[PDB]
Design a protein around this ligand. Sequence first.
Ligand SMILES: Cc1c(Cl)cccc1NC(=O)[C@@H]1CCCO1
Length: 211
Amino acid sequence: SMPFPKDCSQAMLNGDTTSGLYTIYLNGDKAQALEVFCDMTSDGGGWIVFLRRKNGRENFYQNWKAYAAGFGDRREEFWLGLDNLNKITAQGQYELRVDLRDHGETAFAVYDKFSVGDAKTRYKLKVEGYSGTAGDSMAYHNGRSFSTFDKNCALSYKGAFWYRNCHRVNLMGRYGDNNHSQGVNWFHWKGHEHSIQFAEMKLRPSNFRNL
Ligand SMILES: Cc1c(Cl)cccc1NC(=O)[C@@H]1CCCO1
């Protein structure tokens, strides 16, 4: 096992094959411990989950400081934090996976390159190299800074995202809100008038598939 695994891929190779909460260490630094939920079953496992929507119990209409730091219950609905995502994606070449489920139907998207810039970039999104079944709805958002109501699409749709003008993905939107563009949307799967019941965003090294 590695003593200070830097992501859920190094924790899974540590023989931890049950999804749930693990400690990772940013940059393998014992002083940068972070509790994360690891999805160890989807497409080979080793995924840090960074967004989960499933029941509408948690409020996602939160401010810049909340989105930078993270909020929620890792075992239920949560957001891992932009500072965490920047530091993790800086450690190597990461891939994004999005899992969606709604009324028993499932879809997914993978982006072979995923990064989040630091605060001086307003946490700029990079997403490239699409595959999957959900439809490439993150392409619209590529290269955009993050937006909250206090730093306006976040205000107009009462959510937070790498908004443009405004969204094809709104996974931090209002739970169960089927009004146009208000809900948990993935446009090229279920459009703008269908809020998706279950959504996860997660990341792991792009080279995991053959390491
Ligand atoms: C990342 C995160 C999750 Cl996922 C769950 C609850 C809170 C946070 N954020 C923090 O623990 C830090 C601690 C000081 C301010 O935020």
